Design an enzyme around this catalytic site. Structure first.
Site, mmCIF file in Angstrom:
data_model
loop_
_atom_site.group_PDB
_atom_site.id
_atom_site.type_symbol
_atom_site.label_atom_id
_atom_site.label_comp_id
_atom_site.label_asym_id
_atom_site.label_seq_id
_atom_site.Cartn_x
_atom_site.Cartn_y
_atom_site.Cartn_z
ATOM 1 N N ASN A 1 31.361 -73.592 -71.906
ATOM 2 C CA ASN A 1 31.651 -72.281 -71.517
ATOM 3 C C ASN A 1 33.053 -72.248 -71.045
ATOM 4 O O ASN A 1 33.419 -72.478 -70.165
ATOM 5 C CB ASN A 1 30.771 -71.550 -70.558
ATOM 6 C CG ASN A 1 30.884 -70.317 -70.107
ATOM 7 O OD1 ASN A 1 31.551 -69.761 -70.930
ATOM 8 N ND2 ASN A 1 29.870 -70.038 -69.207
ATOM 9 N N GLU B 1 21.427 -72.206 -62.955
ATOM 10 C CA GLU B 1 22.836 -72.234 -62.251
ATOM 11 C C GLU B 1 22.812 -71.833 -60.848
ATOM 12 O O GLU B 1 22.255 -71.031 -60.376
ATOM 13 C CB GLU B 1 23.953 -71.299 -62.948
ATOM 14 C CG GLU B 1 23.595 -70.399 -64.144
ATOM 15 C CD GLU B 1 24.614 -69.445 -64.498
ATOM 16 O OE1 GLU B 1 24.456 -68.048 -64.509
ATOM 17 O OE2 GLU B 1 25.902 -69.761 -64.434
ATOM 18 N N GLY C 1 31.675 -75.424 -67.696
ATOM 19 C CA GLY C 1 32.751 -74.494 -67.564
ATOM 20 C C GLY C 1 34.064 -74.815 -67.599
ATOM 21 O O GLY C 1 34.542 -75.458 -68.155
ATOM 22 N N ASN C 2 34.736 -74.923 -66.131
ATOM 23 C CA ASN C 2 35.971 -75.441 -65.866
ATOM 24 C C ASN C 2 36.428 -76.964 -66.510
ATOM 25 O O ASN C 2 37.288 -77.037 -67.366
ATOM 26 C CB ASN C 2 36.246 -75.551 -64.395
ATOM 27 N N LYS D 1 34.737 -69.502 -70.717
ATOM 28 C CA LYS D 1 34.672 -68.288 -70.029
ATOM 29 C C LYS D 1 36.108 -67.524 -70.614
ATOM 30 O O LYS D 1 36.227 -67.429 -71.756
ATOM 31 C CB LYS D 1 34.921 -68.539 -68.631
ATOM 32 C CG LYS D 1 33.930 -69.694 -68.140
ATOM 33 C CD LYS D 1 33.520 -69.657 -66.657
ATOM 34 C CE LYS D 1 32.367 -70.293 -66.089
ATOM 35 N NZ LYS D 1 32.146 -70.256 -64.716
ATOM 36 N N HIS E 1 24.298 -64.789 -67.381
ATOM 37 C CA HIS E 1 25.355 -65.758 -66.646
ATOM 38 C C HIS E 1 25.571 -64.893 -65.071
ATOM 39 O O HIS E 1 25.802 -63.829 -65.244
ATOM 40 C CB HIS E 1 26.605 -65.900 -67.556
ATOM 41 C CG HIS E 1 27.320 -67.199 -66.882
ATOM 42 N ND1 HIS E 1 28.395 -66.627 -65.906
ATOM 43 C CD2 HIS E 1 27.342 -68.322 -67.114
ATOM 44 C CE1 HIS E 1 28.740 -68.060 -65.567
ATOM 45 N NE2 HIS E 1 28.213 -68.826 -66.265
#
Lengths: 247, 241
Positions: free
Chosen positions: B8, B163, B225-226, B10, B93
């Site tokens: 992801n 999450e 993510g990150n 983002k 999300h």
């Protein structure tokens, strides 16, 4: 003389073959981009496809932009990313986004700041509801809406205002060119008061209500109407005639 | 069930950063028949990213509209996503629940629209810090899952993501929640279905903690993510290999 400005807001429509032809059915129409701005705002996942097919004379943009920068905002498109992709225009504060997605004047302001900060051109929408108009608050609400962001405008060629008469969209009522003109005049005065005479005379103000081939010519001839943000009618090949009205 | 590792990105990336990162990723050899790997770039990067990535990588977008085609300025319909052969969508999300007021009703309607157009859905949910502090974790997650779980037809094509908004989370905590999530699917859907359905951990996943998470019985992969912005992400993929 302000450069006239005719924009195609395809909204949530189109299908690879649909674009392709319509972009070709445009395209053939000859015009000078130095005298008339023509912008096409396809859906985000159609941008690359639409940009390649359209000739350099057509400007392009996207229908929304994030109020946040890059980072952890799943689903959003930053002005930074838009800059990198050489996306020229963004639409901000459209009635549909105010309504369905709860976008406020604070959002509009923040989206505009982000867009200018990344060298983007902004098509900024606003307008009053039927019951606001019924109570003679038209000037009041529009002043509030415009004042929410108008102090941010640096180059007055790069920010374009759009009056959408929400009061005559899905309500039964229908706006005449004289009424549009009268509101457009007031909008220009608000820019005059808050920014200056030269800036108000420079800034394009578009009509963002229902625009089609039947009414477009009678709208653009109005003194303070400088073009349109066209929806429904911009999906058709006859849109090219709406461009001709400002030619 | 196939393990499932998702990037992801983002709201990140540039045409250049994507050229290289996508090239890094392409070098790593893996079999798509045995392991699912999905990349979710930002909408205006989709075409660019799809071309650069090799067929072994699946792709998708980070949100989808709850409305069809029509007068919804700014939105991307499942219809349009279908036409473009977009395979996956992320729904619900935390960032969209928070910043853009997405509800469980929205999640349900987005999922219906996505399945209706032959799209695969990565559906997220999870409890806040204060919900966890008041022992509402199981309550909230049950409510959130039950909001949409009756719509799942093919249990390969809908993938759950826990999450922990509240964070970070240890593998035992994650495992315990994942087990409960599977039980909800088990007794409100069926046995073959709960054992079929992938459930990913969607908290902070990096190279340090990925291996200890995927070895948990009910953790079937990640929504990263990150860490999915880095070339080292390939090692997070290796943890599920």
């Amino acid at each position: 003389a302000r450069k006239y400005f005719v924009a195609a807001n395809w909204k949530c429509n189109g299908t690879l073959e649909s674009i392709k032809s319509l972009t070709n059915s445009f395209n053939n129409l000859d015009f000078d981009p130095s005298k008339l701005d023509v912008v096409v705002f396809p859906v985000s996942v159609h941008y690359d496809h639409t940009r390649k097919l359209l000739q350099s004379k057509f400007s392009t943009g996207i229908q929304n932009v994030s109020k946040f920068g890059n980072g952890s905002y799943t689903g959003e498109v930053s002005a930074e990313i838009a800059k990198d992709l050489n996306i020229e225009y963004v639409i901000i504060g459209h009635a549909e986004r105010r309504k369905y997605f709860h976008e406020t004047d604070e959002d509009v302001r923040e989206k505009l700041q982000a867009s200018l900060k990344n060298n983007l051109k902004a098509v900024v929408c606003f307008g009053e509801s039927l019951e606001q108009r019924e109570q003679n608050k038209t000037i009041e609400v529009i002043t509030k809406q415009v004042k929410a962001f108008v102090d941010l405008i640096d180059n007055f060629d790069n920010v374009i205002l759009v009056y959408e008469p929400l009061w005559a969209i899905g309500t039964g009522k229908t706006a005449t060119p004289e009424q549009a003109q009268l509101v457009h005049k007031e909008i220009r005065k608000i820019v005059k008061d808050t920014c200056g005479e030269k800036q108000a005379n420079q800034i394009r103000i578009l009509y963002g209500g229902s625009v089609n081939t039947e009414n477009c010519s009678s709208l653009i001839q109005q003194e303070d109407i400088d073009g349109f943000l066209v929806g429904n009618a911009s999906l058709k090949e006859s849109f090219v005639d709406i461009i001709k009205s400002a030619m």
